[PDB]
Paper text:
The gamma-tubulin ring complex (γ-TuRC) is the principal microtubule nucleation template in vertebrates. Microtubules are formed de novo in a process termed nucleation, which is spatially and temporally highly controlled by γ-tubulin complexes, composed of γ-tubulin1 and associated γ-tubulin-complex proteins (GCP). In most eukaryotes, microtubules are templated from a preassembled γ-tubulin ring complex (γ-TuRC) that determines the position and direction of microtubule growth. Here, we used cryo-EM to identify and characterize γ-TuRC assembly intermediates after recombinant expression of the complex, which allowed us to delineate a comprehensive stepwise assembly pathway from a stable 6-spoked core to the mature 14-spoked γ-TuRC, identifying successive stabilization and conformational locking of γ-TuSC units as central principles in the assembly process.
Residue numbers in the entry:
A (entry chain N): 546 to 787
B (entry chain 2), C (entry chain 1): 3 to 41, 45 to 93, 101 to 177, 180 to 279, 287 to 306, 313 to 447
D (entry chain N): 848 to 890
E (entry chain M): 452 to 586, 607 to 663, 674 to 771, 814 to 844, 851 to 872
The structure:
Amino acid sequence: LDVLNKKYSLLDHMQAMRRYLLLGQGDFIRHLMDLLKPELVRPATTLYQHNLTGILETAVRATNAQFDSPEILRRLDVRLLEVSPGDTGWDVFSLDYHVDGPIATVFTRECMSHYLRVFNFLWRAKRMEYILTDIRKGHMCNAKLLRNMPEFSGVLHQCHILASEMVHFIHQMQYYITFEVLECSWDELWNKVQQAQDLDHIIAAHEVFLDTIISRCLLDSDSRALLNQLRAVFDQIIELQN
Amino acid sequence: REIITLQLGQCGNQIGFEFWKQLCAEHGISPEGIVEEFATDRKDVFFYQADDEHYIPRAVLLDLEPRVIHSILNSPYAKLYNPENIYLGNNWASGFSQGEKIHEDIFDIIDREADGSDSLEGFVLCHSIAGGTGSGLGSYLLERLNDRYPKKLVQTYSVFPNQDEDVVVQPYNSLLTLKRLTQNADCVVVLDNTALNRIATDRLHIQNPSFSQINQLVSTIMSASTTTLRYPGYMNNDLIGLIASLIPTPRLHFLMTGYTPLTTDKTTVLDVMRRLLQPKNVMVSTNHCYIAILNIIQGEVDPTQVHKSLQRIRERKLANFIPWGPASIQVALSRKSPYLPSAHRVSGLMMANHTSISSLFERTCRQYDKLRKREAFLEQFRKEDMFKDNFDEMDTSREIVQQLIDEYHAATRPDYISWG
Amino acid sequence: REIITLQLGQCGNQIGFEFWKQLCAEHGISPEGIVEEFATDRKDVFFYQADDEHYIPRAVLLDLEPRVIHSILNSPYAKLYNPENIYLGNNWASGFSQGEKIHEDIFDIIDREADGSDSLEGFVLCHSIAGGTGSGLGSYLLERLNDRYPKKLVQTYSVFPNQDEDVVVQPYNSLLTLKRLTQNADCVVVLDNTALNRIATDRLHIQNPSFSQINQLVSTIMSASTTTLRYPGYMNNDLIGLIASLIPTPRLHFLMTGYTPLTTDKTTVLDVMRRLLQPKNVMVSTNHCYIAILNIIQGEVDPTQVHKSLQRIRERKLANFIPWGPASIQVALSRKSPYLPSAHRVSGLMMANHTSISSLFERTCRQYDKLRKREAFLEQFRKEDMFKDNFDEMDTSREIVQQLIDEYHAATRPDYISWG
Amino acid sequence: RILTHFYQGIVQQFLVLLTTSSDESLRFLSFRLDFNEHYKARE
Amino acid sequence: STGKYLNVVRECGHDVTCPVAKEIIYTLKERAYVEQIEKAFNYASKVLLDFLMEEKELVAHLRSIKRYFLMDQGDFFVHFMDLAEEELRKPVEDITPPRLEALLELALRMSTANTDPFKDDLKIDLMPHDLITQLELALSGLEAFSFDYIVKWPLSLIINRKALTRYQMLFRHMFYCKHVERQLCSVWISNKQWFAGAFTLRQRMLNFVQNIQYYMMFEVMEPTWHILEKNLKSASNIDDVLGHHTGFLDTCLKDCMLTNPELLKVFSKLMSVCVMFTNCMQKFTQSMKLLVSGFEATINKFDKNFSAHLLDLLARLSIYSGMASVISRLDFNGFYTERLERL
């Protein structure tokens, strides 16, 4: 445990697996998602991974991620989804943390798959949330110019709270994922790694950690119908922008 | 993105100085801005980062009749900043005209700082309502920015003047200032002198240097509201993501605050929630109902209690809010702060839109209308005489605040389905 | 639920100050209200709980002609409370009129404290009969609460004035006060000056500072009557559950008390019971029979002796009570108090409705009727002249206390099967 | 107007399915969202 | 029993070895094996009860049994009853268990009953067939209500199914008096006068239930508690603790009105007529604020039934076996000391 935890830095890897993938960090992620935005608006057939790697680097250099070790930023690098006739970059993007030592004995490839699935969900969510705060943006710029035309007041008064009914719903969901999905499992994970003096117990704790997180989102097989409704909450968002 | 701070007036420059001393002591840096080795953080929003890591703040300093600005000038924190931006009555029209003549070079100071930023998120100003030199001038620069940039946000932290009524044109000045606040600003955070007076007289026994302790509480609030920015969180790390849920409507954009310890010299999530439900832990003084509430908690919390708590919070119905529609409380977590002693471990901050503040506006409206009926309280000062010969801007402001109070009183109703 | 305390008058604010110092020394807290680490309890009934565990008492302080209220003001227990509620003759009508003009803002103080409470159980007031400033004013605020809230209880601890008869309108004032007490209150606990004078002259040798030791005994009684609230018991932890058994009838709701040590500087359950059967251990001075008696014991008791004792208590017939029906003594146990030296281990407190107190009322009635026959003892003060030009309220009070004494004397009879 | 009615329709369709999901984890979402007590009082 | 004790400490950690080992043989006339058996058995009992009373301690367990089933700390209960009774008032299949569970944690964590971490085993449950189980289905919250408790393995050896179910069944009988007395006080505040015999009936009923409760609190509860607090401080092994606990449980179960050859049907009819009295009087007062001649006839019916159940109860109590203590209260110079003279 000593030589694995200092020579291959095994503890900093799990701390950074929660940070970047599982969204425990996040000036880094907001600056990534802000600077990656005009590329991902276009289809990903006209985009390649080198064009991601550069802007990712500038996201890393300007933000708080710069005072973290070059190894673990180096092991995290961009990836895409192989193409399909309706490509959007918001459909087609991923990060890959890949193995660079004996940590494959700790981190299975299907564990990175569940990592990327919950990453896909918390990507779609903060995607729709930034569209949502751009809706509130259109509200506080346009309405202060529309004093000077009195006849449009009713419909603009209506659209504001169709928007506010969505903005509250996202101000419950982003706060349900905050208090239940990444402190509970994180507390009990942190406890049964740092008290344990066998590798298999750490392994078996990380496994059930990510697995109960799968059940806690709507990324389970039986909660999928629940999931199906939640996708229908995302249609009326983009519809409202038009 | 990046947020530029503004400060003006005696109370505004006082609370800005206290805010910068707060963030100086809070993070691991020197009073000249050199990083401490013993300390990681982002301080790139309110401070420009230098090569020896001099986090020089984005604070533009404007002064008029400086006495306390001189005390700010000779200080051991005067090596933290020097952006070279310091440029020189007690009336609204006086400060308006004084800002009017120097609007160009202060706008050059604005555009210089804008060029200092690569991107931008919002402008905060430190201002006090009816502060004398601050009043009128602050409304004028609010007009200048609202004319200039419709692409950004303005957040404003300002207090409501109550000195328990020599100055009788103060309701007129505050009325004109709040008129510009409702129509030219996007989100307002307002506080009371009397509620901070209550909390200060409860936590302590001071009466005369109350301003100083008020500054401390403002600094704690302004750090708390910014903690998810300064300590790296992962949601609402833009200002507009925070502001979006609380304000559905462009005139009712006034936000009231609370904070759980009155004295700060376990607590569970249930305890701090129900404490935060009190108006005596809120720093602003028919049934009134909130439109929406937001809470951010910072401390040593256990993540499983919090869902238990909001279950039981539904069950007891210890809040009474029903605007007309499905807008409820939003609870969030931020980091318990290192680099300072973490005593009074769990502490919460609370942000809501509630209709009750209209009554306090109505109190001022009752005063101003009374003085407007007598019409002897402008004192015929020449400044308000030049700026409006007919004094019809006061009547226009009266009809606007009438629309505002009527929007408030309709916003209480569960028929606010239309006109929202 | 929660019980709000009230205090007014010189004797009432004296005994309230002594009660709060009693509960300060009794529980493990500081004289500013900080909890001691070395100390568990509920203090949520008579104290609002804070974040640094400042148990700020539910005590509204009203003053008129303050001399001793100033001494209460500068104190090391003046950091325990500051609810900001202090607001400024010796006649009943004077105190009535002075309370009449300020009834609105003191009612605002009432409603503010009511909003401070989530739920409510009762109002206690600290008051003295014919105390001068307290008299009349206390009757007025009793009228205000009885008009305002029929959903709550009022408990009243007040003494009977006997100075062994310059003030000759005192029987009139006490008569009007007790008239409001019988008709506008639900339960009364009354005491005598003379019985406490007897116990004080027996236990000690003081004559002049007798008020101070009277305050100590009142504090011990008021702690004892509240111990099952403050120390967590499991029965009659509401006030109304305690009050319900002793009062069958809305005019005979006067309760007399006793307490087993006269000097407090084994005892068995038999010993303390028979001591408590004495009128010399009772602090209030045809055959008279109780309606019902209640006893609460606190000490190091053995649980098997107590059934032996009440067997033999039936057998000796050392009490003589027969109202007409099956209402007997109720014995209860509370915790022997920690955090203080437990010497004089077992101590009891006794609560009954007995008809003998009517005689003491009759003594006052004999005095007042004599003065009413002469009609020279109102002294023609202007206050009673404004409030009643014809002085017919005295005759109405006379007919009411006539009904009361007749109800008492019929209540002695074993034909009280009807009119109960 | 049709958009508003569709939004109210889709949210009650969430909650009526949310009533029988799981004893601790998923049920709690229904109590985050309703604090305003006209949800399921439009039913 | 010597080797049996070693497993139930070895099951929860540390198989402990003997302090000295001897070789045991039979020899004619020489019973030196006997004292060796007693020394090993005595060490087994010593280390076992030294395991039990510190780790998974029994003392705080007994305190937290006295706290809720025997009702020692009931500030929690006057929190709980007031804030939940309006939800308890609904019949069965109109209440849901999350609502009452949240109200239970409400009253627990508001209250001063916050002193030990064995308050969190408490859950609300029901008895579906309340008194037929002793040798409702349409109501719950009025005649079906209980508290749940979980155990640990060293506390499973002393307390088990039987002790917990006697605790539920004594709690239920105590719940009956709690509910009627708070109904009677709520009627008392409704008048803070003309037809007034109902006031006398109310006073008689409430003095009666207080006579019953302080009879039961100070004859059954605290006496056998202190004798248990003597027996447990002189116990020699865990079978001694078991004997003292079983005798204690038998005494607190025998001594109330839980054990009777008929379960005292007179008592059930009497609390029924008390509940009926409370209901119609509050109904009549609220239909008067918004005849006292027909109401007098109903109060006569209630008074007759109350007096009949009272005389049946004194006659069936005096034949039992220290039992007269409620009667040595009730008739002081004598009322309900004898009404119908037999012969």
